[PDB]
Amino acid sequence: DPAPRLAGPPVFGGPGNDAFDLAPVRSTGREMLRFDFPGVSIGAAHYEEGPTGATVIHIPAGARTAVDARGGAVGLSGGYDFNHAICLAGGAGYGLEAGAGVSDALLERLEYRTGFAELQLVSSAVIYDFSARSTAVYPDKALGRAALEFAVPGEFPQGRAGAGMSASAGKVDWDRTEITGQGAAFRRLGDVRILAVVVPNPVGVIVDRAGTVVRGNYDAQTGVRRHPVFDYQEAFAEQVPTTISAIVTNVRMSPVELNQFAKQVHSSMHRGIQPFHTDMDGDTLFAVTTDEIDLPTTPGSSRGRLSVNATALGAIASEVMWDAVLEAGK
Template sequence: MTTPAPDPRLVPTPTFGVSKGNADYDLTPSPSPGRGAVEFDFPGVEVGTAEYTEGPTGATVVHVPAGARTSIDDRGGAIGIVGRYEYNHAICLAGGSVYGLGAAAGVSAELLGREQNQVDWQHLRTVSGAIIYDFSARDNAISPDAALGRAALEWARPGEFPVGRCGAGIAASAGKVDYGRAEFTGQGAAFRQVGRAKVLVATVTNPVGVIVDRDGRVVRGNYDPDTGQRSHPVADFAAAFDAEESPRIQRGNTTLTVVVTNVAMADRELSQFGKQVHSSMHRAIQPFHSSLDGDTLFALTTDEVDVASATGEAELSCVGLGAIASEVAWDAVLSSVA
């Protein structure tokens, strides 16, 4: 039985020009629950979302109070990132392009307050963050700021990850061969436990490419309102080259991903684990890692569980975990556009 194609969610064509920003509004952070939540069983991990409805734009915070070793894999050609710490207590994802990086500062300030402003070494709390460009889906310059990042952390709770058009993904979109063909996406999440190993993947999908399901069907992006069909960008690119023209591709894209596991890994293993999962996501997002995307993945481990392969080689176990996490990542991408 073939699943019906999802209804179109076209993004308004941007006008770009003089517009209103944060200073023109009396902004108050609002909760950002999305269309539902993915449940996860991962003690020590909390998730919070907040939004400015006037944008709309938002922030998503993955909080690990005890801290987690981190490896960052940034492959897009237009990265927007702050922190880059190898050990983090929180990861902040936000809209607003480069102007949204301030949301991470709000998370950091809130964590400082929770430590009663103690600034000796053992009380320092580190936060890394990254942003998507979401201005093409709205007609203003409102950006996530420190107040919004702080609110997202304040609303962080264990066990549930809001999905859909919420948090950092509230104005995310995909399939920007032409702005008139782009469709809203959002943020997605998926969780899986295999034995004692836990994997939580969250992603904000805002690519120039389209979203592809496991049957190879384009389910979001590059929707032609005249034909009522979605198509793979390769068809558009090939037609342009056949006509000896430059392909039409719009700027302002990025997919952000956070992978959290409890499996202990050496630094090199964690790095390769992150790269393996990030590489796998090209199956769900096509094209991926383009010069017009700022694709970034944060891989975190809480180092709570030792998992050895049948041969006793931890590296082999990490490869297997990476394969499992790669499927969880595909589930997370698809949940962002459901």
């Protein structure tokens, strides 16, 4: 079991953006994941004054996207089927403004051309992170721009960085909520590349492949984390009577294939986050392809007649995302 990171109770009444001269900081988190994915960059910026942040995945060429918005409490802007960037942020609905900062900077980079085909498209999604801190500072337009400016190829700052600065898990009761973080993982299989990025702020808890609860719902009185279903079932016997994420790959997929891939990978995250896709969550996954590599025409291999196709890619990517969720909770 990891040491606890209890968020502690929120002291409400704290200052907001207008009280500060807010200074973007490039997020470095606890350690840097390095990987090789040409054409993809990541920037993360935060305000210490929150603490809260945004994380921007920039794909300058633009890339086909499916969105799976699955929770009951989704905060999403654009949700486009083609994106030059994905912006994830804290600050609840207010933090969608970070995406406008990214959009504006892309327009300027494009010399303010505005033909239909040249529109710079940014989809943004948010987590509510106001309970995990004592200020009302939200990621703003300037912070979005900073995150884009900080974006570099082949790097991701793990842990408390960017949108993950004040992410937290395990919300049966706030006294047992723990700070998580943001996480990424990367796998290369021949020419195939899969990057997962995740900012888990779940009502549920993070669970590992052995079924151990590793982050969220920590009881200080007992020193142990519990699966929420134990609390829930006891409450019923007694009283009766959000995760935002992206999977980026270079494998060509049709719009239909890509959408089903998104749904598959997203549902797969109920393994590592439990419960998941609840009415209290606004879980949103972006599936993005750079469309560089074809699947073979027939799905066969030494490992099986139906072994090479988009379902197979979905299963592999599902493991990469689990690894990312675990990096976040570490």
